[PDB]
Symmetry: C2
Subunit: 300 residues, 2 copies
């Protein structure tokens, strides 16, 4: 120790791990106080040259804690996780967490789609076509008897067989509105700073999920729309004070956090469709540390 | 890369670097805006198991940032405390060095206090007292030895009243009490692992420079916090440390002390911008990142 895991081996090890299962466990443990989610810290480089965020997790029950450091340089974004022992204070693992991040994000949304989507859902929209959107598809393509799956990004008109080759039910829409038309579940998987979908423009109640974080107060629905949605999120205690649409809604549209009807801890320990349903994830250090730990236990 | 440097190798490379040099440059560099010193983060483990502190630094000059993590694991008769520094690249966002920072830390703590003693002690200061006799006290004694014409050096810990004879004779007396050790002292260096007061600046026979370094508890402090109201207060970095240093937090919360009485920090002292004297060090990530980066340059 410490084992140093570069990208290739990390991906090989990633493939041998049930991320949905690991995060499922992590949330029930968080619900029971067996894991602790510390605050993130963000530090700007001088002269616009970029930022870095440190994400933390304490897995008390497993006797490990960690930091993922993610620099954004000018646009290069990497991620590395250091796992430390709570028993002897020594480093266990230093792991390239670039792919681990993508997986946990999609698997976290996935857990929320499983807990929240109505059992008989048939139509799926994915907005965004990057790796996070593809992972989202990979991790939700089996959760329901989807008849139809729609995908839209701007760039998609102007490589297309990869996208349609991830599922036989997937077709490229020419517009957001086409993709989401008649959708039971809509997964917003974009880099967008600002709204990509108004829930007022829906033909029926849907489950809407959102993951965009790359911007100060980045958000994918209109902040006012939270007041018209049944609102869920990854963690009650952290996400409302950082999710852009949630801040803006509370500062300007009189939205109160107490309107949050459940987080994943509450959903997955059973403590938590006449209106649309909104699920917000912004990423939790605990997800990063859980995953790195799973690699560490696998690496032994 | 990344290189992993364990304890024994870290010490050897440490012997090859000029710590006071590096910290002098560093603190001038921080005053001039060329490096960022964000606040430390303390995270409690659940159920009284302990905590960790993460120290950050951006050395934008040398194209590196990093994080030193320091777990504090509660034990039966004393905490187990470690320190590992991860140094990252600002060009490609990859790790450069994961280094055991146990001894690096000891060195940058003593050297930080030596910078402070230089800039704050009377140029005609004669008698020196050191409270504590462990690794940190040994480092202090060896970094501050040629800063003044010391005519007497006294030293106290309750165990003396091994690896220090390795520093007794690395540079003069061992007192039988705290009081005896600090009689007529011009500079008193508190170099303990104490969580609470080891010296009351009100029982001194005359004014002195009093320095403090202990971080061996969430709010460790080596002087009664109320005493900060009767002392001219300086610290390593005024932007962050007044909000973490035990005695400053307690004084502010209960003794009506206010952080704006901080008459200077080290960036200010070593850029001529500053003004009984107390100096408080709790460690700063930049110091940690600077020293780690030195070891990385050596490879
Ligand atoms: N919540 C979390 O846990 C977490 C963690 C890390 C990252 N993230 C977020 O995940 C996002 C997706 O990551 P990625 O690697 O898949 O990124 P990416 O490769 O940059 O993909 C972004 C996608 O958003 C699409 N998009 C659709 N409508 C858009 C609109 N109106 N404005 C902007 N973009 C629009 C883009 O279309 P084009 O084809 O036209 O570009 C593109 O396909 C990141 O940008 C980040 O904010 C979330
Ligand atoms: N070690 C580092 O790298 C480093 C770096 C930055 C800050 N610090 C801080 O400095 C502290 C000291 O570190 P160290 O490595 O020198 O520890 P150490 O080797 O255990 O030495 C601590 C010394 O404090 C003495 N001391 C004197 N009066 C005391 C009192 N009233 N209560 C408690 N202790 C008293 C101890 O007495 P005995 O001789 O009777 O045991 C001992 O000599 C750390 O615990 C930490 O807060 C350490
Ligand atoms: N290892 C050090 C702690 C490192 C943190 C320095 N600010 C100690 O014994 O207390």
């Amino acid at each position: 120790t410490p084992h140093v895991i570069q990208q290739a081996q990390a991906r090989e090890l990633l493939a041998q791990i049930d991320v949905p299962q690991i995060l499922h466990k992590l949330f029930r443990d968080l619900a029971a106080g067996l894991a602790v989610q510390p605050a993130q810290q963000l530090v700007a480089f001088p002269k616009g040259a970029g930022d870095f965020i440190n994400y933390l997790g304490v897995l008390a029950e497993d006797g490990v804690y960690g930091v993922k450091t993610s620099p954004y340089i000018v646009p290069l974004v990497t991620a590395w996780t250091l796992l430390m022992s709570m028993h002897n204070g020594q480093p266990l693992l230093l792991c390239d967490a670039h792919e681990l991040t993508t997986a946990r994000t999609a698997a976290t949304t996935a857990l929320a789609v499983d807990a929240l989507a109505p059992l008989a859902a048939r139509r799926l929209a994915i907005i965004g076509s990057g790796k996070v959107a593809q992972a989202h598809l990979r991790y939700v393509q089996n959760l329901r008897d989807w008849q139809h799956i729609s995908l839209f990004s701007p760039s998609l008109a102007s490589t297309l067989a990869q996208l349609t080759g991830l599922d036989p039910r997937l077709s490229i829409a020419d517009s957001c509105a086409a993709a989401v038309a008649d959708a039971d579940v809509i997964m917003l998987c974009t880099s967008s700073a600002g709204p990509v979908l108004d829930p007022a423009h829906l033909s029926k109640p849907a489950l809407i999920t959102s993951i965009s974080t790359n911007a100060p107060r980045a958000h994918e629905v209109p902040p006012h729309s939270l007041n018209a949605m049944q609102v869920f999120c990854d963690y009650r205690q952290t996400t409302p004070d950082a999710a852009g649409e949630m801040l803006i809604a509370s500062e300007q549209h009189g939205w109160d956090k107490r309107a949050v009807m459940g987080d994943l801890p509450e959903l997955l320990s059973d403590m938590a469709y006449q209106r649309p349903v909104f699920f917000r994830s912004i990423g939790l250090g605990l997800e990063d540390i859980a995953l790195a730990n799973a690699l560490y236990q696998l690496q032994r």
